Amino acid sequence: FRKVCNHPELFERQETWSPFHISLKPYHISKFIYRHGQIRVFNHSRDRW
Amino acid sequence: DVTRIERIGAHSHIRGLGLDDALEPRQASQGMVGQLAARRAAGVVLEMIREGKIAGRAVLIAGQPGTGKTAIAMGMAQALGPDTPFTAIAGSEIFSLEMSKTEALTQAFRRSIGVRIKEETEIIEGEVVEIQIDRSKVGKLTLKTTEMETIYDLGTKMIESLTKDKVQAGDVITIDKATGKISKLGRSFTRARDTKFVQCPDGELQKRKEVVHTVSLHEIDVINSRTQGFLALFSGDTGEIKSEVREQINAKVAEWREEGKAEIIPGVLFIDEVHMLDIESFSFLNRALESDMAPVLIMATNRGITRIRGTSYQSPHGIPIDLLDRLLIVSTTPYSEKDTKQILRIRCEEEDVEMSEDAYTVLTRIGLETSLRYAIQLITAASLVCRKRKGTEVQVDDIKRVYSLFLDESRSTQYMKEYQDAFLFN
Amino acid sequence: TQRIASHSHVKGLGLDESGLAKQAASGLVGQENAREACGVIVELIKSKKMAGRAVLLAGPPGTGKTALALAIAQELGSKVPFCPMVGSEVYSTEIKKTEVLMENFRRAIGLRIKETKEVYEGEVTELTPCGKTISHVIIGLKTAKGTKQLKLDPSIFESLQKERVEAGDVIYIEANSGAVKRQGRCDTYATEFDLEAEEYVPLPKGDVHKKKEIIQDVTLHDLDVANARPQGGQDILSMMGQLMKPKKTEITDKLRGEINKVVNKYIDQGIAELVPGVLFVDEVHMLDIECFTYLHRALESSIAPIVIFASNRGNCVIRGTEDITSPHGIPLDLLDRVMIIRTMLYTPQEMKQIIKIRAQTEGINISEEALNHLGEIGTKTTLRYSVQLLTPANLLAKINGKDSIEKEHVEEISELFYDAKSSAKILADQQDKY
Ligand SMILES: Nc1ncnc2c1ncn2[C@@H]1O[C@H](COP(=O)(O)OP(=O)(O)OP(=O)(O)O)[C@@H](O)[C@H]1O
Ligand SMILES: Nc1ncnc2c1ncn2[C@@H]1O[C@H](COP(=O)(O)OP(=O)(O)O)[C@@H](O)[C@H]1O
Numbered sequence: 001f002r003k004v005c006n007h008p009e010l011f012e013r014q015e016t017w018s019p020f021h022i023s024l025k026p027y028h029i030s031k032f033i034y035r036h037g038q039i040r041v042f043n044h045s046r047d048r049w
Numbered sequence: 050d051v052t053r054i055e056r057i058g059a060h061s062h063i064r065g066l067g068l069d070d071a072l073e074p075r076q077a078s079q080g081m082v083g084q085l086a087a088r089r090a091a092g093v094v095l096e097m098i099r100e101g102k103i104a105g106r107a108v109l110i111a112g113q114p115g116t117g118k119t120a121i122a123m124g125m126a127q128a129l130g131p132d133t134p135f136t137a138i139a140g141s142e143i144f145s146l147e148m149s150k151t152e153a154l155t156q157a158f159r160r161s162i163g164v165r166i167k168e169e170t171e172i173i174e175g176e177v178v179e180i181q182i183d184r185s186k187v188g189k190l191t192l193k194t195t196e197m198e199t200i201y202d203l204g205t206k207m208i209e210s211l212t213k214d215k216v217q218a219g220d221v222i223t224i225d226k227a228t229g230k231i232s233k234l235g236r237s238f239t240r241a242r243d244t245k246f247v248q249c250p251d252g253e254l255q256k257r258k259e260v261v262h263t264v265s266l267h268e269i270d271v272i273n274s275r276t277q278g279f280l281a282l283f284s285g286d287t288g289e290i291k292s293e294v295r296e297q298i299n300a301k302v303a304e305w306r307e308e309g310k311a312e313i314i315p316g317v318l319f320i321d322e323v324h325m326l327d328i329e330s331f332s333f334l335n336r337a338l339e340s341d342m343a344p345v346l347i348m349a350t351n352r353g354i355t356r357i358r359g360t361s362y363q364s365p366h367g368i369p370i371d372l373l374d375r376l377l378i379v380s381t382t383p384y385s386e387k388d389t390k391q392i393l394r395i396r397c398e399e400e401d402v403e404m405s406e407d408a409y410t411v412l413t414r415i416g417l418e419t420s421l422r423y424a425i426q427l428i429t430a431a432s433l434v435c436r437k438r439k440g441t442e443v444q445v446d447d448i449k450r451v452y453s454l455f456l457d458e459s460r461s462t463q464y465m466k467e468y469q470d471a472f473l474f475n
Numbered sequence: 476t477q478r479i480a481s482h483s484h485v486k487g488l489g490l491d492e493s494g495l496a497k498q499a500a501s502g503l504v505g506q507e508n509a510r511e512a513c514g515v516i517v518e519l520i521k522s523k524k525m526a527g528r529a530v531l532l533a534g535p536p537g538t539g540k541t542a543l544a545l546a547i548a549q550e551l552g553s554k555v556p557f558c559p560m561v562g563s564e565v566y567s568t569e570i571k572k573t574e575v576l577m578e579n580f581r582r583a584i585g586l587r588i589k590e591t592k593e594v595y596e597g598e599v600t601e602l603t604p605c606g607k608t609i610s611h612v613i614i615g616l617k618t619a620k621g622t623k624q625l626k627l628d629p630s631i632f633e634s635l636q637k638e639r640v641e642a643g644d645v646i647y648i649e650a651n652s653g654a655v656k657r658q659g660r661c662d663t664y665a666t667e668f669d670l671e672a673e674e675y676v677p678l679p680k681g682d683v684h685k686k687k688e689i690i691q692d693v694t695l696h697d698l699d700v701a702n703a704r705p706q707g708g709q710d711i712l713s714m715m716g717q718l719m720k721p722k723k724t725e726i727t728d729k730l731r732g733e734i735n736k737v738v739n740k741y742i743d744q745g746i747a748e749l750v751p752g753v754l755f756v757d758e759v760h761m762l763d764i765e766c767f768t769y770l771h772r773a774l775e776s777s778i779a780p781i782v783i784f785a786s787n788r789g790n791c792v793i794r795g796t797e798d799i800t801s802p803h804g805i806p807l808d809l810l811d812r813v814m815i816i817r818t819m820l821y822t823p824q825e826m827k828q829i830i831k832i833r834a835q836t837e838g839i840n841i842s843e844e845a846l847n848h849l850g851e852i853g854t855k856t857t858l859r860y861s862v863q864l865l866t867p868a869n870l871l872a873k874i875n876g877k878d879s880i881e882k883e884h885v886e887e888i889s890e891l892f893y894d895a896k897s898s899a900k901i902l903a904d905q906q907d908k909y
Contacts, residue, residue: 027279029272030262031227032166032310039273039297040710045652046691047701049588072874090891096870103837103866104478111898113908151563173670190670204671229672276707276716289569289723293582293697306477315478332563332758339481339541353902353909365899371787373895374536374859377867380893380901 062399066124068092080395081124083388084117090379091121095128098345101315105343109323109373111366112381114351115422121381122319122347134265134316134344136161140325148288151333155295156287158337159267161344163314164302167261173224174256176237176249177216182208192222194250221247226255263314266342269298299342316344323348324367327359331372338375348376389416389424396425402432404443411445415452423457430455484836485542487549490514502832503546505825506539512816513543517550520781523751527779531759531810533786533803534818537858540785543818544755547783556585556694556752556780562761569723573769580773581696581731583754583780586738586747592687595625595648597679598661602642604632616646618679631655637712645676698734699726735778752780759784760804763795767809774812784813826853826861833862839869840879848885856894864888 003010036042055061065079072092074085081088087110094108110118126135136157143153175192182188188203190211203211210229216222219240223232235245271287272278273294281287305311320326326334337343352367364370366378384392390413397404404412408431416424430451431443440447456464465472477483489501494514496507503510509532516530532540548557558579565575600615600622612632614625627635631648634655640646645658659676703726709716741747756762762770773779788804801807821829827850834841841849845868852861864885872884893901902909 027282028262029279030166030264031168032262033264033269033272036305036310037269037272037301039294041654041656042301043297044654045590045592045649045689046693048652049586049691049693070874072871086891093867093870093888093891096874097866100866100870102479104480104483106863106866108892113905145568147568149564149567149569151561151566171674201670202668204668204673206672207668207670210672224670226670226672227674275721276709276711276713286720289567291700291723292564293694293700313478329563329566329761332761333561336541336559336561336757341478341480341483343480351909353906354899355909365895365902370895371536373898374857375863377860377863377892378894378898379891380898 057400060120060123062395063120063124064127066091066095066121066128072096077391077395079124079128080399081117081120082391082395083384084121084381087112087117087121087379087381091125094345094347094379095125098129098133098315098317104315104341105338106345107338107376108345108347109366109368109376109378110347110349110381111378112351113383113420115420116351116381116383118349118351118381119321122321122349125347126317126319129317132263133314134161134163135319136317137319137321140320140322143326143330147285150327150330152289154330154333154337156267156290157318157320158343158346159270160265161316161318161346162266162342163263163316164266164269164305164311165261165263165314166311167259169257169259171226172256172258173226173254174222174250175254176221177218179218180211180216182212192254194252194254195248196251197253199254221249266298266302266313269302270295273298303341313342318344318346319349320346321349324350324352324355325358328357328362328369329359331357331369335372335375384421386413386417389413389421392421393424393428396428400429400432402428402443403441404428404431404448405445408443408445408448411448415448419457419459427451427455479837482542482545484832485546485549488513488517488543488546499828499832501546501549502836503539503542504828504832505821506543506819509534509539509816509818510543510546513547516781516783517547520547520551520555520751520753523749525781526751526777527774527782529774529782529784529813531784531786531803531805531813531815532818533815535820536787538818538820540787540818541757543816544783544785547753548755551753554587555750556583556692557755558582558752558780559755559757562756562758562766565762565766567723570725572763572766574725576766576769576773578696578699578726579754580779580782581699582694583752583782584695584778585750585752586691586693586695586741587750588691588693588747590651590689590691592685592689593650594685595623595650595683596646596658596681596685597622597683598645598663599640599642602632602635616683618681618683620680620682623683625650628653645679695731695734695738698738699731702734703727703730753783754780755783755785757785760786760788760791761794764793764799764806765795767793767806770809771812821853821858823850823853826850826858829858830861830865834865834880837865837869839865841865842879842881844882845880845885848882852885852889856896860894864892867892 062080066088067078067081068074068088072089074088076082097103097106110122112118129135138157143150143157145153173192175194178191178193178198180190186205186208188208190201190203192199206229210231214231216231216233219236221234221237223234235247237249238246268282270290271282274287274290275281302311302313306313350366354363354365355367356363357367357369365373390409393409393412393416412424412427415427427448431447434450435443435447438447469475485502487501488510489503490496490511494511496511498504519525519528532544534540551557560579565572567575595616597616597618600617603613605611605613609629611629612627614627616623616625631653634653638655638657640657643661643664645661647656647658659674662675662677665675704724707716738747742749774782786803786805790800790802791804793799793801793804793806802810827846830849830853831846849861849864852864867888868880868885871887872880875884
């Protein structure tokens with residue numbers, strides 16, 4: 001009882017707070033979509049014109 | 050027990066759309082009851098969805114409020130399940146501040162048609178028995194399953210991967226051989242000493258696994274839209290996606306379909322409360338339902354002959370005849386007493402509460418006097434007064450108590466006519 | 476296989492060589508006066524002489540105003556641009572209404588550019604760079620069909636280094652475009668280490684070198700877009716292209732002046748040829764009075780595509796005018812700028828043929844008694860309702876163990892799924908409970 005009344009750091013020290021840190025799954029793109037499925041790639045010969 | 054995010058909600062009791070092979074609904078099963086006409090009709094629509102061969106098709110579920118028109122539409126989603134896209138929106142959800150009202154329907158139509166592909170991958174999986182490295186670089190790895198062991202000469206791009214990710218002897222790991230990515234599953238139980246612990250894989254180390262994968266047709270549009278597309282998929286930055294990109298992607302998927310490298314999996318759009326759409330949005334549904342990539346869509350409404358939004362014109366369902374001519378209308382019907390009591394039993398199973406048989410009778414009277422939905426809301430509050438009473442079971446005087454604590458709309462409206470000048474505006 | 480869409484049964488206008496309409500052909504039936512007239516519009520579009528000239532298909536719901544407009548697209552074929560749009564797409568939230576008209580008017584004019592495709596692919600056997608320093612890089616290629624050496628431009632070798640290519644990789648070079656892709660490491664090197672983070676591919680069984688004539692389709696709108704804003708300039712491989720979000724923009728009038736001046740230069744040099752296409756506007760009555768007053772200029776303009784409009788409204792109010800009524804929902808001063816085609820209601824004897832054509836397209840066998848009965852439903856309701864009953868009735872027939880429609884299967888569906896008329900009667904008889 002005296003410890004808390006004297007200074008609360010004698011009972012619990014104030015912790016070094018920080019935001020909660022999180023990651024999702026990486027968003028999985030199929031090899032097929034990556035090979036044949038972007039207009040930047042499959043249309044590049046047209047895009048030149 | 051613990052509670053996950055999904056808790057007991059207004060449709061949690063529906064675990065399917067209970068039907069025989071004949072597409073005839075038995076009186077009560079899979080958590081829903083009655084509606085023999087509307088559920089036989091929903092069975093036929095569920096087969097049109099599962100067949101997939103006919104494109105751009107619509108059903109409107111219509112009838113008095115509280116008659117299960119959202120219930121059969123939600124049960125149909127549970128019965129359809131994973132491995133076919135189903136997407137739901139409320140009619141006022143398309144009115145974006147950041148995107149065209151017409152484009153918001155074009156996204157909803159193309160979240161709900163899937164592309165499906167299969168790809169083969171050399172995957173290595175095992176317990177790492179030992180790993181060694183030198184100062185270019187050279188090194189050596191050993192992996193074990195319950196049925197074989199190997200040693201391996203590592204290359205440099207693996208050496209940098211194993212060392213970056215601190216792979217240690219006694220881990221159980223998956224190596225994506227095509228990509229150099231390491232996933233660690235845990236540690237072996239025999240090296241759990243000095244957390245997560247797991248047994249070694251079975252079979253051989255290097256498996257040529259086949260992965261089937263699916264991408265919504267819209268999810269291909271967003272990948273194509275930006276220097277990195279997929280961020281805009283989650284963050285909502287997808288907006289006014291350039292229609293010439295769709296003119297290409299729809300034609301590209303239309304050759305993958307027939308070169309056989311992909312197959313398209315028609316899903317469902319459930320555009321709930323359809324009477325919220327403007328005549329401008331109906332003008333889009335009039336024409337977006339007439340192309341090969343269109344899903345089947347379910348629409349639900351509870352409106353009489355009504356003013357269609359954006360005009361002074363009145364028409365059935367709150368939909369212009371323009372669009373009703375595209376579609377089939379399935380009518381729900383008002384519940385009988387038998388069906389009303391049976392829904393209350395099933396809600397009492399789903400909320401896990403006991404109540405007296407005469408309690409179910411007076412609650413069925415209340416249900417028939419108040420269009421069911423209010424009686425369903427009394428179930429929980431009656432059980433909480435029973436818990437306050439330390440009762441085993443809900444009694445008639447628990448229901449008669451709670452019926453006086455919480456008003457239905459009719460008694461609330463009637464009391465609002467006593468103090469009619471004390472409330473503001475009339 | 477392909478999915479059966481609403482208009483997948485129509486394959487053309489099906490006119491005979493005199494220009495007259497057959498009674499039933501190419502998936503269409505009846506409609507002679509309207510579809511004979513669409514023949515004259517196909518002759519107009521294929522003649523290329525005209526700009527901005529326009530047509531209005533008018534008449535009740537379920538009468539062919541979308542079917543004939545898509546039949547025109549089948550008579551033109553994939554070689555001629557046909558841009559479909561809904562009048563309700565004009566309400567963008569990033570650009571003004573008149574810009575969405577102008578973009579769609581520019582999607583309906585096509586350049587037709589010819590170039591030889593030239594692909595080299597194979598395992599790379601060597602690289603040797605040859606101011607004296609790098610005039611070119613020699614590269615050696617191998618496939619199971621043989622070998623070549625190629626003399627690369629330093630810009631292509633910069634792309635090989637972009638892809639992190641080395642000798643023993645399998646490469647695709649598109650020599651007419653400068654595209655380069657690593658397919659994988661060649662599997663003759665698959666034992667260089669027992670476990671390394673590369674994917675190995677078999678030595679290509681294809682030719683080292685392949686040629687085609689290819690024909691590129693590009694619209695004037697693709698030029699107006701791709702040249703207006705600064706490009707991303709960043710082939711993913713970057714990071715500035717993460718910061719500025721791409722968005723639609725009110726592309727200036729002047730730039731279109733220069734695109735027209737550059738395209739004129741190239742069609743004179745014979746590097747390109749032109750196909751003035753069609754813009755097809757579904758639901759034209761859903762355009763605002765401001766949009767209709769922009770078409771009072773756009774339809775005059777000496778570069779504009781042919782325009783086809785559809786409407787099904789009576790003498791209603793014009794959208795956004797507060798109180799002005801005009802036929803078809805179109806202002807009289809725009810209606811005075813279009814050739815109007817009227818569209819007829821079908822007799823039951825025409826509807827039965829449409830139901831048969833839909834059934835045999837949709838894959839349904841139907842007994843003559845049930846086909847007569849869907850003809851009777853065509854007397855009660857509308858063509859679209861009767862057509863829509865076929866697949867539902869097929870599923871009940873299939874569940875009842877037969878591969879053909881018979882009376883009780885269609886009579887079940889007729890009791891099970893309502894039309895607009897019957898459901899509107901059910902609403903009016905319970906009007907106080909909705
Ligand atoms: N002459 C025809 N022969 C065969 N089928 C036709 C014919 N004309 C129209 N159809 C049928 O009409 C149905 C609806 O298309 P239709 O062109 O009639 O739409 P519409 O009502 O005129 O268009 P909109 O809604 O924009 O006014 C389609 O299922 C199609 O099969
Ligand atoms: N057939 C049914 N079987 C079981 N529960 C039902 C059934 N029909 C309705 N319900 C319950 O009653 C509620 C009222 O029906 P609902 O579909 O929500 O009506 P509405 O959409 O018109 O508001 C449902 O949300 C559900 O809780």
